[PDB]
Every structure is written in structure tokens, then in C-alpha cells.
Design a protein around this ligand. Sequence first.
Ligand SMILES: COc1cccc(C(=O)N[C@H]2[C@@H](O)[C@@H](CO)O[C@@H](S[C@@H]3O[C@H](CO)[C@H](O)[C@H](NC(=O)c4cccc(OC)c4)[C@H]3O)[C@@H]2O)c1
Length: 138
Amino acid sequence: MLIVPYNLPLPGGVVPRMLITILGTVKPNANRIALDFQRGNDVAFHFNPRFNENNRRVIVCNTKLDNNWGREERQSVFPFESGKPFKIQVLVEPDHFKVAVNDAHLLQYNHRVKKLNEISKLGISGDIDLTSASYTMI
Ligand SMILES: COc1cccc(C(=O)N[C@H]2[C@@H](O)[C@@H](CO)O[C@@H](S[C@@H]3O[C@H](CO)[C@H](O)[C@H](NC(=O)c4cccc(OC)c4)[C@H]3O)[C@@H]2O)c1
């Protein structure tokens, strides 16, 4: 019931101890999901579940700088299921983003973009019904 793509402002950027929670349901014949933590036009952290990349399910993570994608980091563990409700938690830690899905740790992504306080937007897109997007400090 939120409109997708959805932009969640992150006022003053991110900081260690900030927890971002996304609740939604994957659409039945989903192809992709994306979370894009942005620093202006750059994408500090792109989190991209792909449901059918050569008939395999994979999560691709990357950074986009000056319109150029970098080296992908790929994860073979794939917790999403078409048609099913999910929870994504992204905890900012000093050295990484730490991602858990459905309360199970999934992956960490080392900070490539250093100016955490300038990562001031989260875009949420793809083949989901989005229920809520929020943040809190733990
Ligand atoms: C679809 O709707 C939208 C909507 C809005 C935005 C976007 C968006 O910008 N998505 C891009 C983003 O996800 C980006 C992330 O890197 O990937 C690219 S695809 C990428 O293309 C690269 C060549 O240019 C290579 O082929 C690369 N593969 C590897 O590096 C590789 C590595 C190891 C192992 C391996 O094993 C198979 C493969 C491919 O992932 C997406 O197009 C798409």
C-alpha cells in the first residue's frame, strides 16, 4: 500500500546504530527487488535480489559512483519467495551494512562510500507490495 518505487529520506545520512526496516510482500511472479542507499546520484549500497538470472536466484550487491557500477558482491543464500511477506533489516555498523531477512542474518557489505552522513536517501523498488519503511536507533 506504499507506492513503489518509494523514497525514504534518511535525515543527516546514516550512522552506526541506525536500523532500517522494510516490510512488504513479494509479488507472485517476481523478477527483482532493489534497495538503493544513495549519496546524491551515487549509490552507496545497492541490494538487488534477482529471481531469475539464468534460472538461478541470487542477491547482487554493488556501489555506483559517477554513474559507474563497481565490483559486485554476490550471495547464493536467497531468503525471498514469490508471493510471501518478508522483513528486511539493514543495520549500519561502523565497517559495514549488516542485512538480516526474516530475522536471519544474510550478508554484510563493507562501506565503499565513506561519508555515511551524506547517504541521505533510501530508494525501494521492484516487484513488491510495500507495507512500511522506517528507521530507528538501537
Ligand atoms: C532491471 O531494472 C532496473 C531498474 C533500475 C536499475 C537497474 C540497475 O541499474 N540494475 C543494474 C545493477 O543491478 C547492477 C549491479 O552491478 O547490475 C546490472 S547487470 C550487470 O551487468 C554487468 C555488465 O554491465 C555484468 O554482466 C554483471 N555481472 C557480473 O558482474 C557478475 C559477477 C560475478 C558473477 C557473475 O555471475 C553470473 C556475474 C551484471 O550483474 C544491472 O543492470 C535495473
